Amino acid sequence: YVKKPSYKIVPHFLGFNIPTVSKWIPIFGIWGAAAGIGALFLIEGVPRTRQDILSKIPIIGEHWIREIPASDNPF
C-alpha cells in the first residue's frame, strides 16, 4: 500500500530548470558557431582579419596572402 505519491521539486528559476536547459545546451553551441561564422564572414574584408586569422588557416590560408607588385602601387 502506497500512502503518498513519490516526487521532488527540481530547482528552477524564471521558469527554467536544469533538465530543460541541458537539452538546449547543444543548440546554443550551434547558434554560437552560426554567429561566429557569420561575424567572421562579415569582417573577412578587414585586413587585420586576414593578417591575424584567415591567412593562418592551413592549406586554405594562402587565399588571403596577396601582395600588390611594387610597380603597381602608387602608395
Partner: protein, 402 residues
Amino acid sequence: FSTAEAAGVKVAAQDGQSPISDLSVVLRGGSRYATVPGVSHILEKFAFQNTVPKSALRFVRELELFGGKLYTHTTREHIVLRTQFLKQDLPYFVDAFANVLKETKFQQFELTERVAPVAELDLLKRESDPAFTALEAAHEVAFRTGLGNSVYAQGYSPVTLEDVKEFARQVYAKQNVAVVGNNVVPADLQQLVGTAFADLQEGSKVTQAGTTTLHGGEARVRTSTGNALTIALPIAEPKPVYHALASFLGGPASMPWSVGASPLAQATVGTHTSVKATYHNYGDAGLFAITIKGDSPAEISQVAHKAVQALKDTGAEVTEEQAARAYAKSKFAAAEAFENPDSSASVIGMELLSGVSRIAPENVQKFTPAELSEAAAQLSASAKPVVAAVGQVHALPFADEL
C-alpha cells in the same frame, strides 16, 4: 459488500480480482434535504476544492501522478463522491476524503470563480436534453418540496457561501456519511477509515423539512431547444412491482435499427420519437413516469395518447409470456445497476445510511400477470396525474386531454 462500522462511520467493501479500486463516500445530502434550492449541487461541486492540508491544485497534480480519476454527482437522496485508482493507492484516497469532510476551506472566490460556473455548465449540459427537463419538471409538480426541490443549482435562486457552509456543517458529519469500496479489501478499509475519519464531527441525521406530499398538475416549460413530454403518476406506497411494470412497458429497443416489442416502443411506430418508462422509488413515495421526446409536437401528442392507452390495456390483461419478459428485463436492469459504479455506490449507500436492505438481482421477485395488471390499473386510475410538457408547449397535450 461486507457492511461494518469504523469509528462511527458505516463502511461497506467487497474485495475483487482487479487492479482497479473504486472508493465512494456517499453523503445523506441530496436535494430532498437541501436547506436552500441548489445547495446540494453546490456542495457536490465544492468537493476537492481547497482544504487546509492540501490545495485543489495540489490534489489534482497528485491525482495525475497516481493516474486516479474523480467522479461526483448529486441525486435527490445523496451526494456521491467517487474516486477510481489502483488498488495499492488506497491510503491516499482515504486521507483525501478525510481532508474534504473535515477541512474544506469554503472560500468566497472558489464559489464565484470555480464552483458556481462549473455547476452552471453542468446544468446547461443536462438541459440540452428536453427529456431531462420534462422529468425534472414532473418531480417538481408531483412533490413541490423535498423530492420536488430542484436537484441542480439554478440562476434565479442564488446559493451563497453561507448557505453552502451551513449545509456542509450538517452533512459532513459521521451520521450522514457512508464509505463504499469496490475491489477494496474490507479489513484494510476499516483500519484506514478508522484512523482518518475519527475526528469528524458526529453531528445529527439530516432530515427533510416536512413530510412528502403528493400533488397532480401540469408544467409547461417553453423552450426552443427540442420537445418532450412526461406523464408521471405519483405513488404513495412504493412497491417493487412498479420496476417490473416499467421494464414491461419498456420503450427503448433491445436491438440496433429496431423499434422493439415493448408496448411503449410499439407506440412510436411511424414517428421519429422515443419513449421510456421509469420508476423512481424514494422510500416514502415513488414516481412512475413515461417520457416521450421527439422533434415533432404533433408526433409527441400522437404517441402520448397511445402511451396512456398502453397503460390502460396493461391494467386489463397481461399474458404469461409478457409477465416472464418483465421478470427477465427487470432482473437484467437490476444486475447492470449493481455493476455500474455510480448506481452501485448509491444502492449500498441507501442500505447503510437508511436501513433498506438491497435486493440482490438474483432475488428480484417474479410478478404474476395478475400482480402486474393490478399495478397498471392503479396507475391508470390515479387521482393525481402529472404532465410536464417541454418545447412548443402550445402544441403538446394537457393532463385533461390524456
